[PDB]
Design a protein around this ligand. Structure first.
Ligand SMILES: *[C@@H]1O[C@H](CO[C@@H]2O[C@@H](C)[C@@H](O)[C@@H](O)[C@@H]2O)[C@@H](O[C@@H]2O[C@H](CO)[C@@H](O[C@@H]3O[C@H](CO[C@H]4O[C@H](CO)[C@@H](O)[C@H](O)[C@@H]4O[C@@H]4O[C@H](CO)[C@@H](O)[C@H](O)[C@H]4NC(C)=O)[C@@H](O)[C@H](O[C@@H]4O[C@H](CO)[C@@H](O)[C@H](O)[C@@H]4O[C@@H]4O[C@H](CO)[C@@H](O)[C@H](O)[C@H]4NC(C)=O)[C@@H]3O)[C@H](O)[C@H]2NC(C)=O)[C@H](O)[C@H]1NC(C)=O
Ligand SMILES: *[C@@H]1O[C@H](CO[C@H]2O[C@@H](C)[C@@H](O)[C@@H](O)[C@@H]2O)[C@@H](O[C@@H]2O[C@H](CO)[C@@H](O[C@@H]3O[C@H](CO[C@H]4O[C@H](CO)[C@@H](O)[C@H](O)[C@@H]4O[C@@H]4O[C@H](CO)[C@@H](O)[C@H](O)[C@H]4NC(C)=O)[C@@H](O)[C@H](O[C@H]4O[C@H](CO)[C@@H](O)[C@H](O)[C@@H]4O[C@@H]4O[C@H](CO)[C@@H](O)[C@H](O)[C@H]4NC(C)=O)[C@@H]3O)[C@H](O)[C@H]2NC(C)=O)[C@H](O)[C@H]1NC(C)=O
Ligand SMILES: *[C@@H]1O[C@H](CO)[C@@H](O[C@@H]2O[C@H](CO)[C@@H](O[C@@H]3O[C@H](CO[C@@H]4O[C@H](CO)[C@@H](O)[C@H](O)[C@@H]4O)[C@@H](O)[C@H](O[C@@H]4O[C@H](CO)[C@@H](O)[C@H](O)[C@@H]4O)[C@@H]3O)[C@H](O)[C@H]2NC(C)=O)[C@H](O)[C@H]1NC(C)=O
Ligand SMILES: *[C@@H]1O[C@H](CO)[C@@H](O[C@@H]2O[C@H](CO)[C@@H](O)[C@H](O)[C@H]2NC(C)=O)[C@H](O)[C@H]1NC(C)=O
Lengths: 169, 219, 217
């Protein structure tokens, strides 16, 4: 009878100032449960079914667990709050052949970003005049590798940390 | 109140328009060119159209190069317009107009030669100081002064053959509104003391025949 | 009203300037490094400066009040006096700039150019024989073989300043050193008389940071 934490939106990697809702799912019963929340194995004040982070800061990173009256303590869910201009967000790291790959060059505060490139293994893979999501419709083995994004915000040339994407046979 | 540049200008191809090399506009054996370079052309909207104008009148003899795939996954497209030396030198304006689907309106760049009364440069070669003779390499100095506009070419030779080991300063604005510069040619001390006549060649629009050449030689 | 500058989307920019060459060489002057923050918005006007010398934080910097600019942004300037020897010993000066319109502080670092200092060779060069037909003649100071490019050059005659001169920026020479030229223009009568002129150069690699070279007919 384990509780489960869900993230909405689902990205476990976020930038400072992003909103993040952690949702606690307890037993699937009409029997109203109360909720409790643990962050880095410490109790926090909220007893709400949804724990809402308005404007994330680095200290909001770490492990979250929740529990309801009719539930055992959840497995941990990890939240990583990054500091910087850009974060390349993926819904997962491992894809199989012919799966769609959808990547998002998330900017700090959703600030407008121009002349955006998604690089694969240090070579330009896709360029867009304005910020736009990267889409491979059918993944192939050659799409695996190290990915980051970069672009212009105002006059600043900025870039995201690298992520590893794998395509399996 | 004036209209402002929109943010749509910020994400679209960019255009850079380059003047001809000054040596090319001055010498008969050369063909001066105006170069319009378009960068940040997407793969999604790759077609680039050029129109060229010389004082507002369209010309059709520009040569557009095939697009080049850049390492960053953009295209770069170049169009080159060959120019008449005299057209350039008489201050005619060159307009490159660039059209592309990612742009709401075409981008226009215009270039022409710097305006103002041309002034003839004075060219003077100076031998190395006696003090530098203790050194293994000596400095041969070419002072060029009183030229306007700043567009100029300066070269070095000995026995008809070009010398490679020289450096020329940027043009510097002088008090009288003219420019001056200095070119330093480094030569082996032995090559100087041998009697080789070294030459400083200076090419500027206001010189007779666009060319002057002063010599430098030992005692 | 000014046009909404899109550069503001990126928040403030930071520029970190070295001391003037003369300031570091002459004990009578105070060398300082200048950290200047530009593109500060009205809505996020507070700027915090931290300064570090070789990574150790210092507290003696002088921060000026934010100054409203023509393009409807703020500019704010913080200056840190540096010690002469510290600068010449290659110490690193770090200006960290904090502002709410940034996702993280911007850190800029300045120090003296690295590489062995190389001593200026100073050569004075009389006007070309061709120029002696003119009313004004050019007196040339070639300063060469120097590293770093930080340097100051002046003219005097009879130990008083001559100010009718222009100096080119330093140019990277083909051996990795720098050179420049300075030109003093004087009346031909003064040269043919002939008065004694001096080109004086300041550079760290000179003895007493100073040398003088004379020029005469
Ligand atoms: C809103 O207004 C702002 C304020 O403006 C002033 O009024 C406005 C309204 C306007 O009319 C102007 O007339 C006037 O400037 C304006 O601020 C300006 O912003 C730009 C950047 O956008 C900034 O540009 C930098 O200038 C550097 C040189 O600055 C010195 O020289 C200038 C002119 O020669 C001076 O005006 C300026 O004051 C400064 O002067 C020195 O100041 C110090 C101490 O105060 C003195 O000790 C020194 O003696 C002074 N004087 C002189 C003559 O030196 C330039 O070096 C900068 O860097 C280049 O930067 C760009 C990056 O943008 C790169 O393209 C280049 O590569 C190079 O950068 C560096 O390159 C190296 C790589 O080899 C490397 O070392 C560096 O890492 C690299 N850096 C970077 C970041 O890449 C740069 O061009 C102006 O200085 C600034 N003006 C002032 C007064 O502060 C706002 O931009 C404007 N905003 C909008 C949105 O419109
Ligand atoms: C993807 O890659 C593209 C190409 O790949 C190459 O990148 C370059 C940078 C190179 O390093 C290699 O790594 C790659 O192969 C990127 O394209 C680059 O895009 C930038 C703009 O983002 C262009 O930058 C402009 O550069 C000009 C000067 O360019 C000359 O010199 C360069 C080296 O110094 C050289 O690389 C260029 O090829 C070019 O060479 C000239 O070419 C012509 C003909 O081909 C010859 O006749 C010349 O002799 C030759 N000269 C020399 C020297 O070699 C520079 O002038 C521009 O600065 C102006 O514009 C800026 C705006 O960006 C502005 O901020 C500056 O202050 C300056 O402003 C101008 O000032 C004047 C006078 O004051 C005004 O009159 C203007 O109106 C004003 N303009 C303004 C305000 O806008 C600018 O830096 C770069 O040229 C280009 N490289 C190539 C190659 O095309 C591409 O960006 C990248 N995309 C992405 C998404 O990453
Ligand atoms: C964003 O800000 C970043 C700052 O990093 C910029 O990204 C940089 O863009 C530069 C170009 O504008 C890049 O510099 C060049 O990189 C080229 C790379 O290509 C090479 O490929 C082969 C591999 O087979 C190898 O030789 C090298 O390892 C390189 O990877 C270089 O070719 C280039 O050098 C030029 O090459 C020509 C060849 O004809 C020479 O003739 C010429 O003299 C010249 O030197 C140069 O080094 C840089 O790679 C890149 N940085 C990174 C980390 O990717 C963006 O441009 C800025 N703008 C935007 C909008 O994002
Ligand atoms: C939650 O525990 C985590 C441990 O993962 C803490 O995360 C670190 O926070 C510091 C600064 O606070 C950062 O520099 C580290 O980068 C963080 N690590 C990771 C992996 O993100 C977090 O601060 C803790 N929060 C609380 C309230 O205890």
């Amino acid at each position: 009878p384990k509780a489960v934490v869900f993230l909405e939106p689902q990205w476990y990697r976020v930038l400072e100032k992003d909103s993040v809702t952690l949702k606690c799912q307890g037993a699937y019963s009409p029997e109203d449960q109360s909720t409790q929340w643990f962050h880095n194995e410490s109790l926090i004040s909220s007893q709400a079914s949804s724990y809402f982070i308005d404007a994330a800061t680095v200290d909001d990173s770490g492990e979250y667990r929740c529990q309801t009256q009719l539930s055992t303590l959840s497995d941990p869910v990890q939240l990583e709050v990054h500091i910087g201009w850009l974060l390349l967000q993926a819904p997962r790291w491992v894809f199989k052949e012919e799966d769609p790959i959808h990547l998002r060059c998330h900017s700090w505060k959703n600030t407008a970003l121009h002349k955006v490139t998604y690089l694969q293994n240090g070579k330009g893979r896709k360029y867009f005049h304005h910020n736009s999501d990267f889409y491979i419709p059918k993944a192939t083995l050659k799409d695996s590798g190290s990915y980051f994004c970069r672009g212009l915000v105002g006059s600043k040339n900025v870039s995201s940390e690298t992520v590893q994407i794998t395509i399996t046979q | 109140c004036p209209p402002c540049p929109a943010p749509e200008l910020l994400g679209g191809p960019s255009v850079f328009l380059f003047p001809p090399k000054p040596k090319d506009t001055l010498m008969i054996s050369r063909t001066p060119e105006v170069t319009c370079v378009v960068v940040d052309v997407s793969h999604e909207d790759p077609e680039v159209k050029f129109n060229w104008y010389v004082d507002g009148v369209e010309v059709h003899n520009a040569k557009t190069k095939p697009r080049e795939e850049q390492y960053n996954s953009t295209y770069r497209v170049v169009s080159v317009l060959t120019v008449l030396h005299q057209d350039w030198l008489n201050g005619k304006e060159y307009k490159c107009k660039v059209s592309n689907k990612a742009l709401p309106a075409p981008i226009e760049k215009t270039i022409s030669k710097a305006k103002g009364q041309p002034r003839e440069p004075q060219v003077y070669t100076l031998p190395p100081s006696r003090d530098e003779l203790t050194k293994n390499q000596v400095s041969l100095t070419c002072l060029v002064k009183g030229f306007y506009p700043s567009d100029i070419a300066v070269e070095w030779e000995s026995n008809g053959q070009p010398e490679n080991n020289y450096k020329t300063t940027p043009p510097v604005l002088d008090s009288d509104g003219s420019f001056f510069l200095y070119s330093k040619l480094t030569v082996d001390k032995s090559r100087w003391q041998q009697g080789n006549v070294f030459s400083c060649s200076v090419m500027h629009e206001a010189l007779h025949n666009h060319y002057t050449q002063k010599s430098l030689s030992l005692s």
